[PDB]
Amino acid sequence: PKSYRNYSKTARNPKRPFEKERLDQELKLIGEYGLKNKREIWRVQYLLAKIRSAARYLLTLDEKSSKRIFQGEALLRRMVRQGLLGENEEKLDYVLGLTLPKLLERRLQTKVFKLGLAKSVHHARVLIRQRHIRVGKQMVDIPSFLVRVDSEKHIDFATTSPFGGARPGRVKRKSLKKQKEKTEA
Amino acid sequence: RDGRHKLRLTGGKKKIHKKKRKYELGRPPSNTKLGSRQVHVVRGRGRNYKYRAIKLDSGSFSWPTFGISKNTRIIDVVYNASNNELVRTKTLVKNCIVVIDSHPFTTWYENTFGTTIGKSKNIDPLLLEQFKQGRVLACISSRPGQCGKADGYIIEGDELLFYKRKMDKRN
Amino acid sequence: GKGIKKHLKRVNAPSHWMLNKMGGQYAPKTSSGPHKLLESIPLVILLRNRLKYALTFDEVKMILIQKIVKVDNKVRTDCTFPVGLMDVIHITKSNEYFRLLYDIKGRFVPHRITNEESKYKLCKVKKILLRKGRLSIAVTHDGRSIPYIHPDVKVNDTVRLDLETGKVLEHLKFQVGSLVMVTAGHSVGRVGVISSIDKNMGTYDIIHVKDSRNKVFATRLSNVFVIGDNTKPYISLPREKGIKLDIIEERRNRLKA
RNA sequence: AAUAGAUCCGUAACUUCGGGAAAAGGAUUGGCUCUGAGGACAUUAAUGUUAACUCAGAACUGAAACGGACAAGGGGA
RNA sequence: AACCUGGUUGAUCUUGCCAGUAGUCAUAUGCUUGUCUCAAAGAUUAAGCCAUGCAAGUGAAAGUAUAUAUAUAUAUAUGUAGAAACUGCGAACGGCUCAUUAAAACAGUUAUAGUCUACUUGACAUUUAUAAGGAUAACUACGGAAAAGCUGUAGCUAAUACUUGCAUUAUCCUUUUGGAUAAGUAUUUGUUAGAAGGAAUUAUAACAAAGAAGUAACACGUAAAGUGUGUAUCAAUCGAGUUUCUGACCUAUCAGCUUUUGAUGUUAGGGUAUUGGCCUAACAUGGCUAUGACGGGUAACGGGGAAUUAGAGUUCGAUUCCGGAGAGGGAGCCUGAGAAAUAGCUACCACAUCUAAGGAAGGCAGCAGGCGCGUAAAUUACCCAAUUCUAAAGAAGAGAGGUAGUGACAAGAAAUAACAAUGCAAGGUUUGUAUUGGAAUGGUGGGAAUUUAAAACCUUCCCAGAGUAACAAUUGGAGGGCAAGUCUGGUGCCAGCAGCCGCGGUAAUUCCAGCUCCAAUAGCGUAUAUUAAAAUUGUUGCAGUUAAAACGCUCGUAGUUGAAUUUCAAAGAAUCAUUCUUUUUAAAAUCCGAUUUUGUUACUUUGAGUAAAUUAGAGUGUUCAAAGCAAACAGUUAAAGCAUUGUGUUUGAAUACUAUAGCAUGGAAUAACAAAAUUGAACAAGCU
RNA sequence: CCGCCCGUCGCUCCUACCGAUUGAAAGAUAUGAUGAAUUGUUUGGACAAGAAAAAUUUUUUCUGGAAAAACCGUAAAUCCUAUCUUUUAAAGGAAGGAGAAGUCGUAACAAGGUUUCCGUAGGUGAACCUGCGGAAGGAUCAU
RNA sequence: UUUUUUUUU
């Protein structure tokens, strides 16, 4: 009877919501990352806190422990795939110390801005919402997409976008200019 | 019918739920008596017919000393290990005491060994006296309620002595 | 009434069946047959989710109606028929033989088998019984009652069974060199030669089994399957070869490609 | 008028703790066939002489009715 | 994220609670709502009542076919079918709900050597025959009443419905071969012997007595002999009933309960499928209890599971699955392997239908829907297409189930814009800031593809389709906790506001309005409950001189807690300077200089049985995510691999958890228990 | 200190307790009585089938058997008594608490003008007073 | 020796 499709939550309420230092730091973060509301900047800390708690649990295990190196190599493989830090940062202590901006930077709405395309982070966000981006052989328009290490090398404009070789310009404007030109001719 | 509606060993009463199920059953008893050999059948659970005897006259009776058995007919019941009202109302159980005709066993004895396998057992004077009288005491062992037939064995020895001592300091 | 349940919920299905959670709420309950429901699987999932031959119950049934599926060279038409732990199944017109073996993780997987090895099937006996005339008949794990067994055969010894004549060929004991297969243990899927036993006083007898990588693991006596002597496995093992490759060092093997 | 003798059971409020109390309220008691149990006198563990009315259960039976007459509390708030 | 803040005062430090704060898969409600995916939904209270419609039926080689239709060479033989009915199976599954329920159910752990077991599989069997007998439907003809899923006589026929009944095998002897000997399967009784388990009165064998039910008087047709249906016994399968041990909320203003009326056990017997006071007759007075019995309450079905969690913990669990219960309340029963069944019946209680007034028929806590209750809960829709069940098993069914409708229960993604120049501001020709003016995308209409049992939704492509992108986002505050106003007008202890402290008599920063800002956002308030906060329930981890709290004092049972003491150390290889690894050092039985066991329990280390869902987590780009358990690989059309022309390959659904209790297991330390002298030993010799 | 404050008595409102009423109601247990339905057994006893005779009928015998009745047994349901649990009526009584201010008195806080307080007992319109034996939380850490 | 009292913010 009841649906078996499991569902969960992503954003956790920060609690004591009227602390000025935290509110201003969140304002700094959302301004520097060109976001739209506080739900994303409440979800992201849950994202980088889940694996931080995993690292906490992993650390207390002693060395040469079968579970310890198992989960450590798994989490480090995910770390290197998601590209949070470079090869030099390899240890569990190294991957424990992560901050909000480094986790944020792997979002598409700023990856496309870093690559160029748009002259603003908000311009990039509205473009990707208007689905003018191509991740490579795959169609993506969600700004919260987490680009891995290997997905960066083939980011380009959307093939079906007007700037990607599709329809050049406004249909109404083109028809109007062509009809006025033929009427004059 | 069984296994509930009874207070625990501590003395507290288990209040009743889980109303009675069919597999418990608990069929009413039967009182097999002397008379015409007619019985009924009762369909047990899982299609297991039971031969329910309510009136028995003849069955099998075994001489245990000789390890033999002959078909004969019971005359009467004289004692039961249960309440005396049963032996008064002429019922048969699997530990009742009944009287068996001595003629078939005497004829078998005369045919085999003679005189009035593992033979030459010297019998006993008390059973010889009972044989000359013509009726002997024997105890039914089979369950008439279940198998529907009254099978028994000839009781001899110190147990026979105890039975007669309790039957007849005595009236 | 409280009679026998004629349904099986999808979530209640055994783990090795591997049923999708969203594909309804009912699992095909295996009919009564030669093996238990837990340690056997039905032809439905065997040919739909494992062989991928069919995609629906109706098409599974219309494959089944034809006498092209044979177990022990016997045509079967029971849709939910318990195949069992170890058996020989055959498809005729395409001429393939599948022997149902284990997997190191502990699932059920058919294994390609030639006609010669298919003719050679093994059954672990459960108990022997004496009948009228002082004759002994032994019952295998396949619900198969084979009479007139060798006197040297013991209760835990396994017996070579021929498919056509239904006769015993040779017995294999429980010796220290007896290669066995854990059937329902926590260490299911690993083949081993056994290292020792411990005869406990009227409880579940345990045996410590030695692996090829010198791994010793204890499992009950009630759930072992003698598959040959120390010479070689009499049964063609699957690709994993019965060696429980460890979980930590499985990922290094998985990652190179 | 209603039971009322007797045995078995059971007995409230209240109380001055003594009572209330035969509280209230019940079953039985007919019959015969029965059965059993409970003192004084003698013998080198037991066997003989000789005096009770109190209980209990199986019967069936009698016109399903019985302290068979006489004799005898009506209770409760 | 192992967290605090306002309030007792003229001011201070405490205790202390109140209030604030955040979460809830936890309910209801107010305001608002452009999108998509996902989907709880009459449990709370009334396990109350139900109109209505449906929810269990079933025939593809194979039971019975002159209702009947059709085709082959010609009334001859085959056929294909087939309404009704007889027969067989199922209907005891499933679905709903949680009233009852307190060592009961449930959960883990055992046994059934104390039992039953449909279908299926595997073995297999004993005391007129060129094929036996009746007994009946549908149907024919007359009806009854208002009717039932109502019904009589006459006649008939079949079957796999019912009932009778037709070889032969084994053993002993001279010793391939001839004689003689005997014929009961289950089940019961009496007397014996006796491949396994752990223990048999086990399997089994021998004798003496009984002894059912069968071993086919039935139907279709596969090798270039077969099948269906039915049958005796055994084993497993699908299960079930009993059953060992361990575990439960509050309450002593529940201290003694049970025992004629079985309570505790013995014997004997009935009954059951089997054990058993389950019951009966006799016998004995026993059984439980401050370690909380017996009672009482629960707005208590139990479980894995949920929330909150640094760890401890606290609260919830009707509800996706397991186990138990019920079908208005009890009780009884047939059938059937399986029911004390209830969309089966019987009787009472309480409701309630038709009625010609005689009599019939009923249980929506099944699916929709209505009434009653209530803060509160959907459509009297479509489909067996997906999963699965039933059957006489492909084509037929299934209010199971799926799909769709309502649905700000919740949950996930994500619109309400972005861009270049002047004007201004800041700054050495860089950022923001009212104008122009164009690109780009959705929302929307339609058309199509795909999709679906059909339809709808999503996605894909093409046309109209944004400048105040009029294609417009609100909720609650702006004294403190706690951000935003002594900004402006109206009212003036009245109105009101205010979770707490407090504001309101004219300058109201707290009311009523506007502008602005503030917090969140298609979401935000309100009420109740619960969790953390709470180290204000404190085992970790509280307090008791004065805030709450040492009994007036002492004795003392249960409980709790209890001095020390019995086997040391030395020697050797390996990382950095240390650390780490290995052997023995008394006595007693074992092996002809050496071969090796020497308390119990608690405790402690390892294992096997550890259902799934859920939990953390693997791997896996549903546009990410909520997901789910996939998918990936070269392939405008061929190469490899292998097969002696073709055949795709690799894979994933692992891991830890599943009490604390049970099983096995190493154990030196710490705890207990015993042996330890009013005597008890061991050795040697002789005696029985 | 022109501080604070206490009680009796006043008025309004709210909450709970007692309450005669053989209180009632509802249920749930135990006792006794009645007892529908019904298992099994027994007695039956419409015929439906057999066996004999005469050449359409009859006597007798054997099963199976429908109505109906009796007996234990399961036991619905109703009533008596007792007990337990849960609500409510109830004339009235006696309290407590909250209200913005009311009257009388001066009780405590200073040696509060009589130091305060405890237990107990008695008296008083009230706070209060008094006796006995205690404490300093005293106004005394002190010949 | 006697000395009672002092609305409401």
Short mmCIF file of C-alpha atoms in Angstrom, two decimals, chain C residues 8-257:
data_model
loop_
_atom_site.label_atom_id
_atom_site.label_comp_id
_atom_site.label_asym_id
_atom_site.label_seq_id
_atom_site.Cartn_x
_atom_site.Cartn_y
_atom_site.Cartn_z
CA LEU C 8 4.97 -14.46 -0.86
CA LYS C 9 5.60 -10.76 -0.34
CA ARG C 10 8.32 -9.22 -2.49
CA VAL C 11 10.15 -7.78 0.53
CA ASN C 12 9.96 -11.15 2.32
CA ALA C 13 11.65 -12.95 -0.58
CA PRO C 14 15.05 -14.53 0.16
CA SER C 15 18.02 -12.23 -0.30
CA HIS C 16 19.70 -14.20 -3.09
CA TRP C 17 16.53 -13.91 -5.21
CA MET C 18 17.37 -10.20 -5.73
CA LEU C 19 13.89 -8.85 -6.45
CA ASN C 20 13.45 -5.17 -7.27
CA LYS C 21 11.55 -3.38 -4.51
CA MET C 22 9.30 -1.41 -6.89
CA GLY C 23 8.31 -4.30 -9.16
CA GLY C 24 5.07 -5.08 -7.37
CA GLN C 25 4.67 -6.47 -3.86
CA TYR C 26 4.44 -10.23 -4.52
CA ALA C 27 7.15 -12.83 -5.07
CA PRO C 28 6.66 -16.19 -6.82
CA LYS C 29 6.24 -18.69 -3.99
CA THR C 30 8.05 -21.89 -4.92
CA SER C 31 5.84 -24.97 -5.02
CA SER C 32 6.53 -27.99 -2.84
CA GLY C 33 9.26 -30.11 -4.38
CA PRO C 34 12.72 -31.61 -3.90
CA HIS C 35 14.23 -28.72 -1.90
CA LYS C 36 13.38 -26.03 0.62
CA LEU C 37 12.22 -22.59 -0.51
CA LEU C 38 15.10 -20.78 1.21
CA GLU C 39 17.92 -22.83 -0.37
CA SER C 40 16.26 -23.21 -3.79
CA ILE C 41 14.99 -20.81 -6.44
CA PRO C 42 12.21 -21.03 -9.06
CA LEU C 43 12.61 -21.34 -12.81
CA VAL C 44 10.64 -18.09 -13.10
CA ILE C 45 13.40 -15.89 -11.73
CA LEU C 46 16.03 -18.35 -13.01
CA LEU C 47 15.05 -17.64 -16.62
CA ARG C 48 13.71 -14.08 -16.20
CA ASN C 49 16.14 -12.25 -13.90
CA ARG C 50 19.25 -14.47 -14.13
CA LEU C 51 19.18 -15.83 -17.68
CA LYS C 52 17.29 -12.70 -18.87
CA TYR C 53 15.58 -14.97 -21.41
CA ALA C 54 12.12 -13.57 -20.64
CA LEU C 55 10.69 -10.34 -19.23
CA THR C 56 7.19 -11.27 -18.03
CA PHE C 57 5.38 -14.08 -16.22
CA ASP C 58 3.18 -14.77 -19.25
CA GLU C 59 6.14 -15.19 -21.59
CA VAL C 60 7.95 -17.27 -18.95
CA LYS C 61 4.95 -19.59 -18.90
CA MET C 62 4.69 -19.82 -22.68
CA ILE C 63 8.36 -20.78 -22.80
CA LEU C 64 7.72 -23.31 -20.03
CA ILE C 65 4.79 -25.03 -21.78
CA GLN C 66 7.13 -26.50 -24.39
CA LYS C 67 9.17 -29.47 -23.20
CA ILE C 68 12.46 -27.68 -23.88
CA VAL C 69 13.48 -27.16 -20.23
CA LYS C 70 14.72 -30.34 -18.55
CA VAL C 71 16.02 -30.87 -15.01
CA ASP C 72 18.08 -34.05 -14.61
CA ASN C 73 16.93 -34.86 -18.17
CA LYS C 74 13.35 -34.74 -16.85
CA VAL C 75 10.95 -32.25 -18.41
CA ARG C 76 9.40 -29.93 -15.83
CA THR C 77 6.22 -27.88 -16.20
CA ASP C 78 5.82 -26.59 -12.63
CA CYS C 79 6.36 -22.85 -13.05
CA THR C 80 7.56 -22.31 -9.47
CA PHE C 81 9.62 -25.46 -9.15
CA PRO C 82 12.44 -25.58 -6.57
CA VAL C 83 15.57 -26.47 -8.53
CA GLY C 84 17.76 -26.99 -5.45
CA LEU C 85 21.36 -26.41 -4.46
CA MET C 86 23.12 -28.70 -6.96
CA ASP C 87 21.41 -30.06 -10.07
CA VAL C 88 21.66 -30.39 -13.85
CA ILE C 89 19.29 -28.44 -16.11
CA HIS C 90 19.26 -28.71 -19.89
CA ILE C 91 17.84 -26.79 -22.85
CA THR C 92 17.62 -29.12 -25.82
CA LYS C 93 17.23 -27.31 -29.14
CA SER C 94 20.04 -24.89 -28.27
CA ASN C 95 21.86 -27.77 -26.50
CA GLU C 96 23.14 -26.15 -23.32
CA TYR C 97 23.56 -27.54 -19.82
CA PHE C 98 23.53 -25.40 -16.67
CA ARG C 99 24.65 -26.69 -13.29
CA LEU C 100 23.44 -24.60 -10.37
CA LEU C 101 26.44 -23.69 -8.22
CA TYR C 102 27.14 -21.04 -5.60
CA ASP C 103 28.88 -17.69 -5.70
CA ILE C 104 31.58 -16.45 -3.36
CA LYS C 105 29.27 -13.70 -2.12
CA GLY C 106 26.62 -16.39 -1.62
CA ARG C 107 24.10 -16.15 -4.46
CA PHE C 108 22.79 -18.63 -7.04
CA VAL C 109 24.34 -18.66 -10.52
CA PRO C 110 24.00 -21.20 -13.34
CA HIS C 111 27.31 -22.50 -14.66
CA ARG C 112 28.01 -23.70 -18.19
CA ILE C 113 28.56 -27.46 -18.27
CA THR C 114 29.27 -29.89 -21.10
CA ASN C 115 27.21 -33.02 -21.70
CA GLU C 116 29.82 -35.29 -20.11
CA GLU C 117 29.98 -33.34 -16.84
CA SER C 118 26.21 -32.83 -16.96
CA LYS C 119 25.79 -36.61 -16.91
CA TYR C 120 27.91 -36.51 -13.72
CA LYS C 121 25.80 -35.07 -10.89
CA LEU C 122 26.45 -35.25 -7.14
CA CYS C 123 23.96 -35.45 -4.28
CA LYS C 124 24.71 -35.20 -0.57
CA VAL C 125 22.81 -37.84 1.37
CA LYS C 126 20.90 -36.85 4.51
CA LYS C 127 20.00 -40.14 6.23
CA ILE C 128 19.66 -43.86 5.57
CA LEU C 129 16.61 -45.88 6.57
CA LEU C 130 16.10 -49.62 6.97
CA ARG C 131 12.91 -51.02 5.43
CA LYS C 132 11.26 -54.42 5.18
CA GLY C 133 13.63 -57.17 4.13
CA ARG C 134 16.65 -55.55 5.83
CA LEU C 135 17.31 -53.22 2.89
CA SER C 136 18.75 -49.71 3.28
CA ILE C 137 17.48 -46.73 1.28
CA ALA C 138 19.22 -43.37 1.54
CA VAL C 139 17.65 -39.94 1.02
CA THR C 140 19.73 -37.19 -0.58
CA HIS C 141 19.45 -33.42 -0.18
CA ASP C 142 17.44 -33.46 -3.44
CA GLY C 143 14.54 -35.31 -1.84
CA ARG C 144 15.72 -38.33 -3.83
CA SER C 145 15.26 -41.73 -2.18
CA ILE C 146 17.84 -44.11 -3.66
CA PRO C 147 17.55 -47.73 -2.43
CA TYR C 148 20.30 -50.36 -2.26
CA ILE C 149 23.24 -48.13 -1.38
CA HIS C 150 26.75 -49.35 -0.67
CA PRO C 151 27.25 -50.61 2.91
CA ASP C 152 30.44 -48.53 3.11
CA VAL C 153 28.40 -45.35 2.56
CA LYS C 154 27.96 -43.34 5.76
CA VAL C 155 25.32 -40.81 6.79
CA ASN C 156 27.52 -37.82 5.94
CA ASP C 157 29.24 -39.44 2.95
CA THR C 158 28.17 -38.24 -0.48
CA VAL C 159 27.32 -40.58 -3.36
CA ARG C 160 27.84 -40.22 -7.11
CA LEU C 161 24.44 -40.38 -8.83
CA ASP C 162 23.85 -41.31 -12.47
CA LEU C 163 21.01 -39.45 -14.15
CA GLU C 164 19.73 -42.15 -16.52
CA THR C 165 19.96 -45.36 -14.49
CA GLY C 166 19.48 -43.52 -11.18
CA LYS C 167 22.27 -45.55 -9.59
CA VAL C 168 25.15 -44.92 -7.21
CA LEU C 169 28.69 -44.94 -8.60
CA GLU C 170 31.19 -44.11 -5.84
CA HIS C 171 31.10 -42.79 -2.28
CA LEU C 172 33.13 -39.90 -0.88
CA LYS C 173 33.82 -39.70 2.86
CA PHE C 174 34.38 -36.75 5.23
CA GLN C 175 38.15 -37.20 5.57
CA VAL C 176 40.61 -34.38 6.21
CA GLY C 177 41.24 -34.24 2.46
CA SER C 178 37.55 -34.09 1.50
CA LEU C 179 36.88 -30.95 -0.55
CA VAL C 180 33.58 -29.44 0.61
CA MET C 181 31.25 -26.52 -0.13
CA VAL C 182 29.47 -24.60 2.63
CA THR C 183 25.78 -24.63 1.72
CA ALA C 184 23.96 -22.26 4.11
CA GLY C 185 26.72 -21.06 6.44
CA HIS C 186 27.82 -17.51 7.09
CA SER C 187 30.89 -18.39 4.98
CA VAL C 188 28.76 -19.59 2.06
CA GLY C 189 30.46 -19.66 -1.33
CA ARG C 190 33.97 -20.68 -0.24
CA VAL C 191 35.33 -24.09 -1.23
CA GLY C 192 37.67 -25.87 1.16
CA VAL C 193 39.35 -29.14 2.03
CA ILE C 194 38.30 -29.14 5.74
CA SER C 195 40.98 -29.04 8.43
CA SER C 196 39.29 -30.75 11.40
CA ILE C 197 36.05 -31.48 13.23
CA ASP C 198 34.95 -31.11 16.83
CA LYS C 199 32.47 -33.76 17.99
CA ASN C 200 30.45 -31.84 20.57
CA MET C 201 28.11 -33.57 23.00
CA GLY C 202 24.78 -33.58 21.20
CA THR C 203 24.91 -30.07 19.75
CA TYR C 204 25.67 -28.72 16.28
CA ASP C 205 28.95 -30.34 15.29
CA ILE C 206 31.37 -27.80 13.83
CA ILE C 207 34.20 -28.30 11.37
CA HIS C 208 37.15 -26.02 10.68
CA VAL C 209 37.73 -25.84 6.93
CA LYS C 210 41.04 -24.83 5.34
CA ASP C 211 41.13 -22.70 2.20
CA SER C 212 43.70 -22.52 -0.59
CA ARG C 213 44.97 -19.22 0.86
CA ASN C 214 45.42 -20.87 4.29
CA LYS C 215 42.22 -19.35 5.70
CA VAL C 216 40.58 -21.41 8.46
CA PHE C 217 36.84 -20.99 8.97
CA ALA C 218 34.43 -22.89 11.22
CA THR C 219 30.97 -23.93 10.06
CA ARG C 220 28.28 -26.35 11.19
CA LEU C 221 28.31 -29.99 10.13
CA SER C 222 24.67 -29.72 9.02
CA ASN C 223 25.40 -27.40 6.09
CA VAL C 224 28.32 -28.88 4.13
CA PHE C 225 28.44 -30.42 0.65
CA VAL C 226 31.29 -32.83 -0.13
CA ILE C 227 32.13 -32.15 -3.78
CA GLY C 228 35.18 -34.38 -4.21
CA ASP C 229 38.44 -35.64 -2.79
CA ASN C 230 41.76 -33.83 -2.43
CA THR C 231 42.68 -34.70 -6.04
CA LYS C 232 40.40 -32.09 -7.65
CA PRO C 233 36.82 -30.77 -7.48
CA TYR C 234 34.62 -33.32 -9.23
CA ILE C 235 32.37 -30.39 -10.23
CA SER C 236 33.43 -27.60 -12.58
CA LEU C 237 33.60 -24.59 -10.26
CA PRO C 238 32.39 -21.13 -11.34
CA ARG C 239 34.65 -18.28 -12.45
CA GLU C 240 35.43 -17.22 -8.87
CA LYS C 241 36.75 -20.79 -8.36
CA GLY C 242 35.39 -21.02 -4.81
CA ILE C 243 38.07 -18.79 -3.26
CA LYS C 244 36.59 -16.08 -1.03
CA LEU C 245 38.68 -13.19 -2.27
CA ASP C 246 38.70 -10.68 0.56
CA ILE C 247 36.48 -7.61 0.59
CA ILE C 248 39.28 -5.08 1.17
CA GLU C 249 41.43 -6.44 -1.68
CA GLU C 250 38.41 -6.93 -3.94
CA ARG C 251 38.33 -3.21 -4.74
CA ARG C 252 41.91 -3.18 -6.05
CA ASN C 253 41.00 -6.05 -8.38
CA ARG C 254 37.83 -4.20 -9.41
CA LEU C 255 39.52 -0.88 -10.12
CA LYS C 256 42.01 -1.99 -12.80
CA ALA C 257 40.43 -2.35 -16.23
#
